[PDB]
Design a protein around this nucleic acid. Structure first.
Lengths: 57, 107, 184, 47, 107, 79, 70, 60, 35, 376
RNA sequence: UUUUUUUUUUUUUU
RNA sequence: UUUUUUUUUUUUUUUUUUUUUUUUUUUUU
RNA sequence: ACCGGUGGUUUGUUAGUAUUUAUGUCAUCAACAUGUCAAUGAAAUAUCAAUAACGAUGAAAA
RNA sequence: UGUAACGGUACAAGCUGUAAACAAAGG
RNA sequence: AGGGCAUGCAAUACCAAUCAGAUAACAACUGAA
RNA sequence: AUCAUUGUGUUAUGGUUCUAUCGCAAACCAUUGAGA
RNA sequence: CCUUUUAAUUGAUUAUGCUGACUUUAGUCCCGAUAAACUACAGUUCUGCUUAAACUGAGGAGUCAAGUAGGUACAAACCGUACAAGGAUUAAUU
RNA sequence: AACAGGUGCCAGGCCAACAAGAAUCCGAUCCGUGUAUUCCGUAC
């Protein structure tokens, strides 16, 4: 984990992300550099792949 | 301590009167202030918040002396101090001030 | 008694103030009584007629002894049905309520009156047995404001506005100086 | 390698051969005495 | 004016012990419940009022410290500190709202 | 050691040092140094203290004890 | 030293016959204080000498009671 | 053997010691050693919301 | 250290020597947090 | 407090209580003269500060007699205005407003009676340093009372001495004097001489000091130095997390208990609260599923198995039941075998379950019956 | 060893 | 009256210090 | 069979344990100071009564 | 990351970071 | 982790010949790590 | 069994070292949750 | 208890041995150059040394140490003390 | 090794939300997990 960092939305540079809670209880992820909202994650159905190493073992 | 910004909306400075064992003039009051304030800033604090008439403001640095734990049945021989570092301020007000506030008394 | 380690805490208690219990062991073995005080923190109970050593002086010139504190594991719950000691089992109903069940008889042991239980002012964990005279005061028989006390009518007043706030805040920030001129 | 060990052994020997000794009674030998008693109680255990 | 620093306090030499004891009395701290309903101006004024009360209290505190004695009714300080923290909590949430909104638009 | 922070002395200070040591306690600049030892002071760098009018304020530092019961009673109505 | 850190405890070990008494200086200091209170008009010596529960208004003492037989 | 705070501070101070070909692994009271001290312990039964653990990695 | 001697020496923090050891209060085998 | 203070306070309070009853005609006339009952303190002080030189037991007796005479005169002054007793005696509660009817007057008279027995040599003394227990007992026997009252007089004498001293010192310096008991008390806290240092390590006698010292010594030993921070002494860290502190202010407004006040309650509260967090949510769901499953197949389960599934406990710290780092629990990990899928086997399973249940029930019933029959 | 409105810059000198 | 700042004269850095916080659209009032 | 949560075993009943600082030297450098967080007691929520004696609680006390 | 200084707390081998022992109630 | 979180550890290295410092116009100018 | 008496014998008091844990995985085993 | 086993490094008057306590020498040795008075009807004790002037229109002609050593009840404690504009035009009040 | 913690000291059947004896005799004060006998739970 230490070998990687999160890219800025607009800046496209390594930065930090902080959580903020709204009045309504809505959680928003905001970047440091640009101060912009982070995009949503990719669906697990798209990232699901078969593990052939396990099958070989 | 934290530096004072240009526009101060929620000041945290705490002002108090200090009872000194020395003699003070009629038109002179002794206060205890932080160690990070200026003459001008002190003046303005009193001028705007309290709205008191001010002529002159003097400042001094107060540092507690060293002490050693030697007394008692089980001394530690360790060093320490009593109190804290502060700014002894002296304000020359227009009006007179009673001595029973600024000066100490003991029978 | 003294404070116990947190790992020793009992989440669910089987004994309540005013409950009838019998001491299982000790100096005062084979003596019954009524619960008067329970300590969750210390894991201890108070029972009348048990450990009465302290003495106090009264204005009438007499003396009275107050019972002490004993471990909660040194007492047992008595079954009114059989009038004999028995272990208790806690059972949770569908409705979400917790009940006490006897092991010998198997009967349901109802809880004591809840109105006769008094809690501490600083610590709710410590319960006490309410007295008849104390309860009568609240049944039939029933702090001035200082100079620096906001009125109850003024304190409650509502003045908050979303639109106003948003309008004002923007302006506040927008209209900000950088240098002092009015000072001298 | 000393007089002290003789006193400790004599003390120990004087209490080892008894039953119903309290913790406050045993002293420094409490562990030893408990192990002895538990060892002894081994013979009474059946299938 | 300057008098406010000690007026009504224990330090005041123009009042008796009963008046000081009556003055000593205080209520409960302002909770977030009540503090949320107020506007910016009311909270801004309450901040200065609490600062004045803290400045008055400190003097007594120090006075007591001098003689190696406990200050009468020490809970006042605690109360004032809680109110001061709650006001800033309110304000900070108010701000965070807008920050969030901004972020959203940029995304 | 005879000299240094080893006997409760603490960090070096202006007081406890020869003449010439430069060490403040935290402040804000209000001017600049000339080429002859003078110092020109500027009023621009002085902070401004903002305080609202307190001539007519109903609010007080503390809340009346009776407030608690009144606030509480409102809750039960929502039930 | 107040901190008690120097080698000032070495000499004290050995016995001594006597020590100096700065009476001359002390007297002067006391006199100055006495004067400073006298100009205002309060007696310090009197208060530092009177018996615990003793009351003596003004410049009065044993001598006062002599002629005051009645 | 004279007493010179100037000399002392110019040759034996915090910024002067770092320039020394010494064994810095040794603990120092009045020095900047390089020995690691294992930090704050694990968490028992307190509030989970108030357990501090990081700062320079989290500052924003 | 004298002025002449001090004018020809670098700082210890300028090198990697400070991240080549595991000395700590526990012992001689230190494991960094989050390792 | 001693009789010196309480008597004056009560007399002054009753003075205002009685003054509040007068009508306009009787109050406007008295407004220009005042009442003697409202000026007892001034006379007490001034009479105390009257004699020159030392203060002896004879002077103390004279001063107390003068105070009693002043109170007696004040009683007649009060009676003079009312005069009549046909209706006012009952409409004003004169019985409770009479200074002579107060307990303090009886105490003053008892003090005078005790002092009446003193010998001239003892009366010509200044301090109670040569007073023997046998002498005190003889005085009590002669006065027909207890030694406590006798000692109270010496205490008072000492107090008087002290008062004299303090008054003298204030008057000399030309500073204000306490006007009321309240003020007196307030000031005495930090402005009161109680010792005179002497050379050659000489001892200074003081009954007032002695008694105070004895009381403080009696009240001091009943203390502990465990939880009290000290310099150079290691402080327990684990204890400071659960041990309550009686120094923090209490807030009724706050719902959740303070961790420094009620750790037990604070811990229980969060448990009681709904699930919060991914892990909590997951555990909740997992628990719920089982609950529903078991509810749908109750007949295939025991009472205890069903009951256990109904427990609601959210917000569980990581591994809160470990033997090494966790809570205490008697029932560990327990599982129940699911019924078979084949109805032929299912029926058998059910029958077994019912047999167990019936066994239990029988066992219980037997005990019940036993008790019933035994109750002869 | 530079003295009172702040900087840059050239020659001589008690 | 000194310290501060130019020169002698030196990152020959006196840890927790400074005329030294991002470097002039400053709202001149 | 990865990955998350819970429990147990071994390391380890046979082995061990360190974090704060008074003192030496210009410096390098060296060094295990001083019982315990602690009256005692299982329990102080048992330390009562007070003037000598006899009295109270506690297994044991003044 | 690991540590030193100052301030608060009860001036302390703990805790804490001027908001210096807590927000738990957004219709 | 809702919120907040002064100051010091000399930091353009999430990149780029070497040699002082906020990392040096060529050359003088040199090298076992 | 030689204390003639300044010796010896017994016993008692005093001196006298100082240990109450705040801890226990990164390895192994079992079980369970979503998705292949 | 008996019996088998034990890598315990398992055995003490002594290495001027290492770490502590406590006797003898042993009520022995050690004590710095100058004091006195404070009364029963007034007063100025003797001696050693000799930079002891504090507005006169002029900051007492300097440096350094004390990591605050001439404040304070016959206190080795607590509590105080560093103002370059000198705040008291405080020549007034009572 | 039922060292899994506590309860006054050595507890499978007592507190610890899910099994199982306030079991009997002995005991200097003196509780007493202790000796002797016996019952029961256990896929702990």
């Amino acid at each position: 984990i230490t070998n990687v960092a999160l890219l800025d939305p607009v800046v496209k540079r390594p930065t930090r992300v902080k959580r903020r809670f709204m009045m309504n209880g809505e959680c928003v992820r905001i970047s440091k550099l640009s101060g912009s909202a982070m995009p949503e994650p990719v669906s697990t159905s798209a990232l699901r792949q078969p593990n052939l190493y396990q099958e070989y073992l | 301590p934290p530096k004072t910004p240009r526009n101060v909306f929620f000041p945290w400075q705490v002002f108090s009167v200090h009872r000194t064992g020395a003699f003070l003039e009629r038109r002179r009051v002794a206060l205890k202030v932080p160690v990070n304030l200026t003459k001008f800033e002190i003046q303005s604090y009193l001028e705007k918040i309290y709205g008191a008439r001010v002529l002159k403001v003097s400042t001094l640095i107060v540092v507690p002396r060293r002490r050693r734990d030697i007394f008692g049945p089980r001394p530690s021989m360790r060093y320490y101090r009593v109190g804290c570092t502060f700014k002894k301020a002296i304000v020359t007000l227009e009006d007179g001030v009673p001595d029973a506030v600024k000066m100490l008394r003991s029978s | 008694m003294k404070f116990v380690h947190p790992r020793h805490w009992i989440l669910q208690w089987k004994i309540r103030p005013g409950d009838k219990v019998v001491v299982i062991s000790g100096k005062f073995k084979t003596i019954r009584g009524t619960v008067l005080q329970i300590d969750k923190m210390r894991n201890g109970v108070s029972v009348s007629g048990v450990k009465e050593q302290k003495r106090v002086k009264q204005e009438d010139g007499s003396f009275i002894r107050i019972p002490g504190l004993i471990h909660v594991s040194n007492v047992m719950l008595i079954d009114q049905a059989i009038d004999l000691p028995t272990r208790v089992a806690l059972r949770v109903d569908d409705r979400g309520n917790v009940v006490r069940i006897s092991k010998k008889s198997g009967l349901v042991i109802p809880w004591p009156n809840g109105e006769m239980i008094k809690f501490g002012d600083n610590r709710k964990s410590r319960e006490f047995l309410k007295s008849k005279e104390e309860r009568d005061v609240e049944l039939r028989k029933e702090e001035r404001a200082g100079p620096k006390d906001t009125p109850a009518e003024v304190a409650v007043e509502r003045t908050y506005d979303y639109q106003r706030d948003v309008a004002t805040m923007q302006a506040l920030r927008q209209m900000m100086t950088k240098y002092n001129r009015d000072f001298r | 390698c000393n007089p002290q060990q003789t006193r400790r052994k004599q003390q120990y020997a004087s209490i080892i051969g008894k039953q119903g000794l309290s913790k406050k009674q045993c002293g420094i030998f409490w562990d030893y005495y408990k192990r002895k008693c538990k060892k002894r109680r081994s013979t009474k255990k059946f299938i | 004016g300057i008098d406010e620093l000690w007026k009504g306090s224990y330090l005041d030499p123009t009042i008796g012990a009963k008046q000081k004891e009556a003055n000593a009395v205080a209520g409960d701290a302002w909770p977030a419940c009540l503090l949320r309903m107020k506007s910016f101006e009311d909270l801004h004024k309450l901040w200065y009022i609490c600062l004045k009360e803290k400045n008055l209290l400190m003097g007594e505190r120090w006075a007591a410290r001098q003689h190696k004695q406990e200050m009468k009714q020490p809970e006042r300080l605690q109360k004032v500190r809680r109110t001061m923290r709650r006001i800033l909590i309110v304000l900070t949430k108010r701000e965070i709202q807008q920050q969030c909104l901004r972020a959203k638009d940029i995304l | 050691a005879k000299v240094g922070p080893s006997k409760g002395r603490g960090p070096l200070l202006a007081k406890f040092a020869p003449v010439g040591f430069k060490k403040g306690f935290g402040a804000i600049g209000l001017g600049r140094h000339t080429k002859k030892g003078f110092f020109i002071i500027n009023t621009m760098l002085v902070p401004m203290f903002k305080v609202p009018d307190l001539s007519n304020c109903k609010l007080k530092c503390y809340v009346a004890p009776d407030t608690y019961r009144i606030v509480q009673q409102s809750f039960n109505k929502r039930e | 030293n107040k901190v008690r850190t120097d080698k000032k405890e070495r000499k004290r070990a050995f016995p001594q016959r006597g020590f100096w008494k700065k009476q001359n200086f002390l007297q002067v200091k006391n006199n100055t204080v006495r004067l400073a209170f006298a100009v205002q008009g309060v007696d310090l010596l009197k208060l530092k000498r009177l018996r615990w529960g003793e009351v003596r208004k003004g410049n009065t003492g044993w001598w006062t009671d002599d002629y005051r037989s009645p | 053997n004279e007493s010179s705070p100037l000399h002392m501070g110019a040759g034996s101070a915090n910024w002067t010691a770092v320039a020394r070909l010494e064994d810095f692994t040794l603990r120092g009271l009045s020095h900047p050693p390089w020995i690691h001290v294992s930090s704050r312990p694990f968490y028992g039964a307190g509030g989970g919301a108030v357990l501090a653990a990081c700062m320079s990695s989290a500052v924003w | 250290i004298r002025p002449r001697k001090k004018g020809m020496r670098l700082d210890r923090r300028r090198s990697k020597k400070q991240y080549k050891h595991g000395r700590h209060v526990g012992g001689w085998n230190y494991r960094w947090l989050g390792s | 407090r001693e009789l010196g203070l309480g008597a004056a306070s009560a007399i002054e309070q009753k003075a205002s209580a009685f003054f509040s009853r007068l009508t306009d005609v009787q109050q406007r006339q008295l407004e220009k003269q005042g009442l003697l009952a409202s000026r007892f303190y001034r006379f007490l002080v001034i009479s105390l500060m009257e004699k020159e030189g030392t203060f002896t037991y004879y002077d103390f007796y004279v001063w107390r007699k003068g105070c009693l005479a002043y109170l007696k005169a004040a009683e007649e002054e009060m009676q003079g205005i009312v005069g009549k007793s046909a209706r006012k005696l009952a409409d004003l509660g004169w019985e409770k407003l009479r200074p002579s009817t107060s307990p303090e007057f009886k105490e003053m008279e008892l003090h005078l009676k005790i002092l009446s027995h003193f010998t001239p040599e003892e009366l010509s003394r200044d301090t109670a340093e040569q007073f023997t227990s046998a002498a005190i007992k003889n005085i009590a026997k002669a006065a027909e009372t207890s030694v406590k009252n006798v000692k109270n007089v010496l205490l008072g004498h000492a107090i008087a001495l002290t008062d004299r001293t303090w008054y003298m010192r204030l008057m000399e310096m030309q500073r204000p004097i306490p006007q009321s008991v309240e003020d007196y008390l307030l000031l005495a806290e930090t402005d009161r001489p109680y010792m005179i240092r002497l050379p050659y390590g000489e001892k200074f006698y003081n009954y007032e000091l002695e008694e105070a010292l004895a009381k403080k010594r009696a009240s001091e030993r009943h203390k502990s130095q465990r939880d009290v921070p000290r310099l150079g002494r290691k402080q327990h860290r684990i204890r400071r997390l659960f041990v309550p502190n009686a120094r923090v202010a209490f807030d009724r407004w706050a719902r959740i208990p303070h961790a420094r006040l009620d750790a037990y309650g604070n811990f229980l509260y969060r448990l009681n609260q709904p699930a919060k967090g991914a892990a909590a949510v997951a555990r909740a769901a997992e628990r719920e599923k089982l609950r529903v499953e078991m509810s749908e197949n109750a007949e295939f389960y025991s009472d205890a198995a069903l009951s256990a599934s109904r427990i609601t406990l959210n917000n569980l710290p990581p591994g809160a039941f470990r033997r090494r780092t966790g809570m205490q629990r008697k029932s560990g990990e327990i599982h129940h075998v699911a019924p078979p899928r084949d109805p032929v086997l299912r029926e058998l399973f059910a029958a077994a379950i019912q047999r167990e249940k019936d066994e239990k029930r029988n066992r219980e019933r037997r005990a019940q019956e036993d008790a019933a029959a035994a109750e002869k």
